[PDB]
Each structure stands twice: as C-alpha cells, then as structure tokens.
Design a protein around this nucleic acid. Structure first.
Lengths: 65, 151, 65, 116
RNA sequence: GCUUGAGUCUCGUAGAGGGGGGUAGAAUUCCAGGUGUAGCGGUGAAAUGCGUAGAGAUCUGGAGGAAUACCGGUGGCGAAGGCGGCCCCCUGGACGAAGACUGACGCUCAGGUGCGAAAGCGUGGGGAGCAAACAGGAUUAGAUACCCUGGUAGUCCACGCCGUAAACGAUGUCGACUUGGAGGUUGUGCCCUUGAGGCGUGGCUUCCGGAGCUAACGCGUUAAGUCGACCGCCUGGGGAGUACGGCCGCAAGGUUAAAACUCAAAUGAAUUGACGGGGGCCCGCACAAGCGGUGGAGCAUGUGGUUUAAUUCGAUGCAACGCG
RNA sequence: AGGUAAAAAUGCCAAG
C-alpha cells in the first residue's frame, strides 16, 4: 500500500531496474495495483515501462523458456 | 449424530480382580450376553497363562500387549472427487477400541479345540511378535503408507 | 512454479505455484471464446463487490452481538 | 547402455489422462509408463490413487540405468499434480525439485467450445 | 447596439480516438530426426478413430497462420457501431487555468448526406487454431440435434457492396432550475507539502436515497421532478412490417407501406398458492463408526409367475408380498 | 475478513 507516487512525483523510468523488479512476482507475472493500492495513472506508467523492459529482455516476458 | 455429543457410563471394575480395560474384553468378546460362560472362558484363559508363563496375572494382559500396540490407521477423506485414503490418528479410546478388537480377529479364527486354548496362546504369541495378534496391527499399517508427507 | 527451497522442504511446499497461477487459471481459459460472458460476468462480478461491501458496513445495527 | 545417473520425470497428467515420462537432461527417453497402461478402463483411470500406483509401475526401468536423482514436471490439472510425486517422493529417489511448466498462452489460440 | 449565449487564441492535460508502416514472446499446428514405445485420444458409458508401416510423450532445430495471459480496475477514450502486446510516422476530439477578441454569429430539423457488430456478396491473396456445410461414431421409441472424431467455406489482409441487431442506460436532441451521502476518475487554486493531507473549485462519473413523480417496479442535480424549443413517433392483438407500387442493391434483401378477413382480447406491474429433472441452513439408524441377521442351503410360509374342468379375490415405489 | 471448487446418461403426452 506504499504511498509511492501520490507523494513521489517524477516519471517512472525502466532504467532503475532495482526499483522496477519490485513490481513483478517471482513467476514473472506483474502484480496489480489493487494489492499495492497505488494509483492507476501512476500504475499506468508501470505496465508500459514493463514491456519496454520486456521488449529489451531486461526483464522476462515469462521465465520458463 | 446431528445433536448432543453423548458420553459414557460407570463401567464396573472386574468383580474377580478390579480392572476396567479388561472388562471391555468381556464386551468385545460377548456373544448373546453369556457372561458366566465368558466368566468361565475369559477367566480360564488368564490364570493358566499366568500359571504357564510365570509372571504376575495383570502383567499378562500387558506382556502380549506390547507388540500389538497400534497408533494409526486409515480414515479416508473422500470429499466427492478424491477417495484417496487418509490415515487417521487412533486416539486412546479409539486405540483401545480396535485393540480389544484385534484379540477378536485373532482368536475367533482357526479354532483349535477351545477358546481359552487359543486365547491363552495368542496372548504369549502376541508377546513375542510372531503370531496372529501382533501382525493384526502390522497389516493395518501397510495399507496406510499408500500416501505420505501431507499437509 | 520453481520451488527447490534449498534442502529442507522435502514436502510439497508449493505455494509458489498455487499462489500465483496454478492450473486453476489454465482451468479458467479452458475451452470457449464467448468474447462476452466475461464482458457480462465482470459487471456481475463487480456487482458483488459493492453489495458485499455494504454487508460489512450495513451490518452496524444492534443485532445483539 | 551408457548408464546415466540423473533424470527427469515429465508427467502428462491431463484432465482424464496421466502419463509418466522419466528421461534424462538430454531428452532421450529413460523410462515411461502411465496410468493408462494399468488398464483402468476409461473413467476409472482418472483417479489420483490410480496414478500413484502407476508411478510404482513407473519407478522401475531407470534403476536399470543407474538413475540417482530427478526433478518432476507435471502438466494438466485433472487429478494428480501431487499424486505421483507422493508416490515419487518415496519412489526411491533423491528428488531435487518440482516445477509446473504449464503452457500459459497469451490469448489467441482459439480454444474449443464443447460441452453444452 | 451591449453582453451574462455562442465561437477562436496563448499554456498544460490523460486516454484501446482514428489511418498506416515495422517488430517481440508464449502457445498451438506441421516438417526432420534422436530416445523410447504399447498405447494415444474420448467420455454419462463408449465407440469413431491415431497406433508395432512404430504414434503418444519428450527434446533439439526448422516451416507457418492467428490472436495478444499477467497488467486490467461499474478503470479510460469514441457520435454510435467500437477500440487495448510493443514500436514509430500522419492526425480528431474533450477538459482546466487568467486574461484577449468578436459581439447572438442560436437550437432543432422534411428531404439530402456521412459513419455504421456479426453474418453475407464480388475480385485477388492467405488458409495455425476454430469451424456452418458435412460425413463417420454415439444417444434415442425415432435423434437428419445436444456428445466424440475428422472436416468445408468463413473466420484473417487489400479494394468495392449490403445498411440491418435486444445497433438496449429498452429512456432523442439543447438550455435553465430544485435536499444530501458514499465515493471513483481526471486537471487545478489556498494553507503548517508540518504526513499517504486539511479547506474549495472544473469535467466525466458508480451506487444510495429527499421532496416529487409513476399503475407499479423503480427514477431520483446522470430524473421517469419543475418548464421551455424543436423533431421522430403511437392509437387493440393478429393479419403485417407482409402484399402490390416506387426507390436502392450484383444477390441476399433493405427501405416507404395497406387492405380484406378473424377474435373479445392480446398487454404491463405485483404478490398469495402451486411447481421446479433450482437452491441456503437445520432435522430422522438416513448413513457414517460399529453390533448382528437376510442374499448361499434346507425347510416353514406368503406373493408373483405358471398350471389347472376349478386351483376365490382384494393389496402390488415409499405407506402390498408371515397382509385382509 | 475472503476466494475455486463439485454430477450434468434418458423418459413424451390429455375427453367431464
């Protein structure tokens, strides 16, 4: 329920891969904004940035290859 | 059933030598309420074994009892899609229940010439883990291993 | 999905599977298209969300608890 | 015979079917058996207890290869998913891990419409 | 003429808005071979089939079409139909902040015009999966259906056409006015941003409820409340949105649209009782758990079925069959 | 607080 960006104003980059991995479960699956309870507008910045990482294989689409 | 959990009674200590556990052997051997005949046979058995083995009387029900000691068995959880067996934790009353029951399955079969004949032998047979009684628990065990390491 | 808890698990301990997408989700995209039963279903699904929501706050009378 | 000392039990435990595939880490088949091979006509081969025993008839044919350890991969929800591993945790095998390699798609292989 | 209507500019705004071009990964289908091999696959039970000519399974490599799990949320955008993997090029609308300017430049609208799910049609490609047609196999008293297995166009891309759907919040378009609450979503102003906030304001927006309204259900500042403007439209059901004629279309048909004839109703709302091859919870040796009989056999005895010139007849899921 | 699960063989019809 981290009050992340409602008080953490900036653009969510994919470069901060350390921060980025905190939103994907161990099984690759990206976790919904419901559990983390943060704002969808902010969470919107997440999913697109995810595929940017997914496209670069910086992270996995799904680990079992 | 669907209502009040019933209990027990005041089980009488044996009017020969006060004891309750063996009193259920009467119950777990009784057929058609023939007590005196049971008093005839049930008695005949123990004293001769006490005489034959050489130890005390009320340590004869025990000498056999060591290797017939059960702990668990199966009580399957067939929810409606999985009739897979689930072993049960056989609680004291539940434990001694099947216990005096194993003296039944053993003695009732292979009738040599008389009840006390087999019963006395089965006792000391049960005392050395080489007879019918002792394995009666063992057989139960091997149909429980079927499933292991559950949660 | 990938459980090998170093050495001492020695039992199922496969919550990693059941917690994310164990075959129940396979048994969610089983066999049927519809396009729409879920279109309708999401609406009715969420329907329960607000009414059950009420059940927790609309239970506030005496009722002799 | 080449006598490999490690292997993998793939298991195709589908809704109404269960086949066990113990191969090595190179895909060459070591030993395979199923609940289907146990006969278990039609409906009856769908029971978890069925697959367990079939695994007992499947834990062999690898001992002849010097098999030591193994990892389990099962697919298909149906019955099982654990039935065999229970019969595999004690099949006489130092098991390393168990994984679910299930094919999660991403919306587009059109699935059948049956069962009305 | 002025400006409280309406219209544009300066600065920001989120979004599956729309057209087009490249590209990622999972998955399935198929090819090639390795290992290995009696099954695979199916279900109500199967059988059809695929199989020792060596599949299934599994693995490496390769050939393809097609849609985008998770995110994802009565979340968002769009006139509606509708639209989401990623990436880029062209490009629409809607909202906010303070002023600038124009100076009623409005609203609605016959006919006209543009868009407009699927299925379908024409022309040329493509053709994984799915799958009308279809056949084989099941089921059935029948089963040209539901189920299994293959399987065709289509589904998919491009260029035209068809213009209809439960195209439905079943509610037209535009403006004003009349209690609040819960929020959600998306910009912004003030204060101690002392903290995920406190105090207002713009829009879209989901549910709840005031007066009122309504036949009721329910709607309720998102009105079906209180008025105004304008327009489409209705007059019992059926016949029939059908025929004939006109227009539009390659066709399918679409569109505008009757009458004769027939009935005394058709229709909505609601709740009692009933029913449910509908459920939520509780209850009885209903079962569990156990005790010990019946089902084997002999015989008693009843019943049925048989047989007999005649072998009286009633009772025959539960609630008849050592019953009258 | 709270969220999956679950069986689906077949059986038609009415003069007071």
């Amino acid at each position: 329920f981290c009050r992340f960006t409602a008080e953490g104003v900036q653009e969510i980059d994919y470069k901060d891969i350390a921060t980025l991995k905190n939103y994907i479960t161990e099984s690759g699956k990206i976790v919904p904004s419901r559990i983390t309870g943060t704002r969808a507008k902010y969470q919107r910045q997440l999913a697109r940035a995810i595929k940017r990482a997914r496209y670069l294989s910086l992270l996995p689409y799904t680990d079992r290859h | 059933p669907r209502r009040r959990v019933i209990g027990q009674r005041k089980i009488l200590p044996d009017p020969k030598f006060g004891s309750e556990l063996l009193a259920k052997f009467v119950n777990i051997l009784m057929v058609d309420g023939k007590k005196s005949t049971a008093e005839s046979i049930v008695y005949s058995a123990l004293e001769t074994l006490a005489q034959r083995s050489g130890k005390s009387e009320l340590e004869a029900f025990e000498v056999a009892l060591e290797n017939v000691r059960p702990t668990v068995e199966v009580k399957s959880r067939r929810v409606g899609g999985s009739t897979y067996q689930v072993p049960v934790e056989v609680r004291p009353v539940r434990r001694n229940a099947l216990a005096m029951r194993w003296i039944v399955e053993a003695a009732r079969k292979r009738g040599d010439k008389s009840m006390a004949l087999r019963l006395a032998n089965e006792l000391s047979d049960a005392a050395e883990n080489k007879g019918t009684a002792v394995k009666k628990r063992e057989d139960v065990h091997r149909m429980a291993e079927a499933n292991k390491a559950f949660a | 999905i990938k459980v090998r808890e170093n050495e001492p698990f020695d039992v199922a301990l496969r919550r990693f599977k059941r917690s994310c997408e164990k075959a129940g989700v396979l048994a969610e995209v089983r066999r049927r298209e519809f396009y729409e039963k879920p279109t309708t279903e999401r609406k009715r699904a969420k329907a329960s969300a607000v009414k059950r929501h009420a059940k927790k706050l609309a239970r506030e009378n005496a009722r002799r608890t | 015979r080449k006598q490999v000392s490690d292997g993998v039990a793939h298991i195709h435990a589908s809704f109404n079917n269960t086949i066990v595939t113990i191969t090595d880490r190179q895909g060459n088949a070591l030993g395979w058996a199923t609940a289907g091979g146990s006969g278990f006509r039609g409906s009856r081969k769908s029971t978890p207890f069925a697959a367990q025993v079939a695994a007992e008839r499947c834990a062999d044919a690898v001992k002849e290869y010097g098999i030591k350890n193994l990892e389990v991969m099962v697919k298909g929800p149906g019955p099982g998913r654990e039935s065999t591993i229970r019969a595999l945790n004690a099949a006489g095998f130092r098991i390393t891990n168990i994984t679910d390699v299930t094919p999660i798609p991403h919306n587009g292989c059109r699935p059948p419409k049956k069962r009305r």
